[PDB]
Design a protein around this ligand. Sequence first.
Ligand SMILES: Nc1cccc(CN2C(=O)N(Cc3cccc(N)c3)[C@H](Cc3ccccc3)[C@H](O)[C@@H](O)[C@H]2Cc2ccccc2)c1
Lengths: 99, 99
Amino acid sequence: PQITLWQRPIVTIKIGGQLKEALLNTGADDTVLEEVNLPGRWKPKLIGGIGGFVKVRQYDQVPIEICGHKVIGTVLVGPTPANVIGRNLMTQIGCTLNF
Amino acid sequence: PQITLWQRPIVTIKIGGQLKEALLNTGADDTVLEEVNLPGRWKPKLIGGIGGFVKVRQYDQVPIEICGHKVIGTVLVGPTPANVIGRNLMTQIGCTLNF
Ligand SMILES: Nc1cccc(CN2C(=O)N(Cc3cccc(N)c3)[C@H](Cc3ccccc3)[C@H](O)[C@@H](O)[C@H]2Cc2ccccc2)c1
């Protein structure tokens, strides 16, 4: 499905059993989700960098589905003003920049 | 073209007569560029807003070159961690997200 950008690219993803919204942010290396409780282990990682660093929880192979696109990928879990799907995951679903 | 996303969508624009490095940021509403002595009139528009706001100069309908695509569009000028090409300037260039 082609998504014009006249509006903020916010699609729905299915994670940890729950349903949430997420912006297809390409200027994002990583994927950060608003506090959740994914099982499995994780590691603590720091992101941001401007204004200090924000620490979150790194998870791996955390299954995730995007617009029906079942996929697997690293999901940083912590405090973000809006759930965001970075390139790390966009590259796993086939998403490309086209013009 | 078809810009995959394993790397960061950095493309060579051509604003103000010079040549630059800009990141195609879908999650980005507007386009802000670190200093470019831009002619004509502008006006104060605060962007960002976390940890406080930030003032950049808004010059409307500004000509810009993006990968051989010539267009016109609002481009805010000021202190920005990187040169970003937001949705406003991606729509005008007919750029889309696909998967
Ligand atoms: N007009 C305009 C100018 C610049 C940027 C944007 C758009 N955004 C950003 O670029 N972000 C800040 C931003 C902007 C420029 C550089 C950086 N590093 C961050 C991060 C994306 C992000 C990038 C890199 C790592 C993690 C997250 C945020 O997660 C996104 O939701 C939006 C949300 C947003 C933030 C501030 C103001 C309005 C809307 C719009």
